[PDB]
Amino acid sequence: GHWAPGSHILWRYRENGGPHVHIARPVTVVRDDADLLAVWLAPGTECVKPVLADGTPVHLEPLATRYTKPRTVQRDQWFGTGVLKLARPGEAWSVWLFWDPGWRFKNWYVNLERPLTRWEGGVDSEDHFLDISVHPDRTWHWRDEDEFAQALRDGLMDPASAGRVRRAGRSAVAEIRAWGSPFADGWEHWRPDPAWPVPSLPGDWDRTPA
Numbered sequence: 001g002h003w004a005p006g007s008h009i010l011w012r013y014r015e016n017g018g019p020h021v022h023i024a025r026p027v028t029v030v031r032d033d034a035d036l037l038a039v040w041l042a043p044g045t046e047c048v049k050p051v052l053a054d055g056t057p058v059h060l061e062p063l064a065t066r067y068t069k070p071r072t073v074q075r076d077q078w079f080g081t082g083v084l085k086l087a088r089p090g091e092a093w094s095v096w097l098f099w100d101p102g103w104r105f106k107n108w109y110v111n112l113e114r115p116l117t118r119w120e121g122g123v124d125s126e127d128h129f130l131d132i133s134v135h136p137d138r139t140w141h142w143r144d145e146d147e148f149a150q151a152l153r154d155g156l157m158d159p160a161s162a163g164r165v166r167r168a169g170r171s172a173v174a175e176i177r178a179w180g181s182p183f184a185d186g187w188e189h190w191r192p193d194p195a196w197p198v199p200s201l202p203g204d205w206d207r208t209p210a
């Protein structure tokens with residue numbers, strides 16, 4: 001079934017090549033139907049993110065060991081402006097919209113990922129490392145090609161899995177070139193309902209349904 005707009009759910013990613021949740025983001029459902037799930041991640045929301053086992057930031061670990069060193073999780077608020085996330089059921093990416101203060105639209109962000117799986121409390125995925133940035137002038141470029149390369153070097157991905165990610169990348173680029181959904185759909189002009197509260201991080205944010 002579908003969640004009513006205004007519902008609170010969790011949007012989650014598992015650790016790379018493991019079963020445990022490492023990213024958990026409480027979000028408000030904007031739209032949920034057979035064609036699209038859209039959610040709003042508000043500024044200040046309490047989230048879960050990965051850190052290295054010593055609590056230090058993943059991004060600061062050299063690439064050579066960034067994906068080999070032991071990790072844990074940390075609660076942290078969503079910094080900066082809120083993000084709108086959009087995902088077609090069954091599709092191997094979601095598209096997130098980023099704005100600067102004053103709702104100055106910055107870019108669409110194509111997050112290549114395992115198609116979201118729905119469960120009672122939200123949606124779960126696995127990030128595929130490679131991303132795409134799309135600018136308001138319709139141009140585009142890759143992000144994190146080097147992290148994608150590193151992940152395959154460390155066996156976080158098979159040649160076959162990597163191939164599937166590259167295929168997804170080509171399909172997303174095809175949509176960008178054609179200016180299809182959701183790029184063409186004016187979500188850059190969407191605004192959250194000011195009455196919506198900031199959703200809480202559930203104490204059981206890490207539960208994994210069978």
Ligand SMILES: Nc1nc2c(ncn2[C@@H]2O[C@H](COP(=O)(O)CP(=O)(O)O)[C@@H](O)[C@H]2O)c(=O)[nH]1
Binds near residue numbers: 080144
């Ligand atoms: N406003 C805001 N943006 C965030 C936050 N965390 C992460 N992001 C953004 O989400 C983007 C993707 O996160 P990542 O770099 O950890 C991963 P990946 O590139 O594989 O999706 C980052 O570039 C970062 O800017 C946050 O708390 N607030």
Ligand SMILES: [Ca+2]
Binds near residue numbers: 111127128129
């Ligand atoms: Ca990503």
Ligand SMILES: [Ca+2]
Binds near residue numbers: 129130144147
């Ligand atoms: Ca990335």
Ligand SMILES: [Ca+2]
Binds near residue numbers: 143144
């Ligand atoms: Ca990145």
Ligand code: NA
Binds near residue numbers: 034089090
């Ligand atoms: Na469908």
Ligand code: NA
């Ligand atoms: Na203002």
